[PDB]
Write a protein that binds this DNA or RNA. Structure first.
Length: 63
DNA sequence: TTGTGTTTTACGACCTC
DNA sequence: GAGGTCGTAAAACACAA
C-alpha cells in the first residue's frame, strides 16, 4: 500500500507511461519491473496506473 | 480568490483465471 | 492468491465568475 494520500506524477513519468501504454494495453510483469525502476515509482503504482488508464479509456469511449 | 466541474492517484469488493 | 474491472474518495487541477 501507498499512503498519504495521493502523489502527483511528473510530466516525464506520465510521458513514459503513455508511450509504454501505446506499445501495449497490458503491461508484462517484466516490463512493469523495468518501467518502475526507470521511473522511480513502485511496481504496484505502475500496475495501478495502467488499470486506471484502461478505465479512463472505457469512460471516454462510452461518452 | 472561491465555486465548480473534471481529472488524477489509490483504495477495497467482488470476479476470473 | 496473483491480477482484473468498476465504483468511489479526495487531492490536484483548470479557470470563469
Amino acid at each position: 500500500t501507498k499512503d498519504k494520500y495521493r502523489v502527483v506524477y511528473t510530466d516525464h513519468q506520465r510521458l513514459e507511461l503513455e508511450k509504454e501504454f501505446h506499445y501495449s494495453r497490458y503491461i508484462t510483469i517484466r516490463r512493469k519491473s523495468e518501467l518502475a525502476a526507470n521511473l522511480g515509482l513502485t511496481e504496484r503504482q505502475v500496475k495501478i496506473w495502467f488499470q486506471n488508464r484502461r478505465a479512463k479509456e472505457r469512460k471516454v469511449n462510452k461518452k
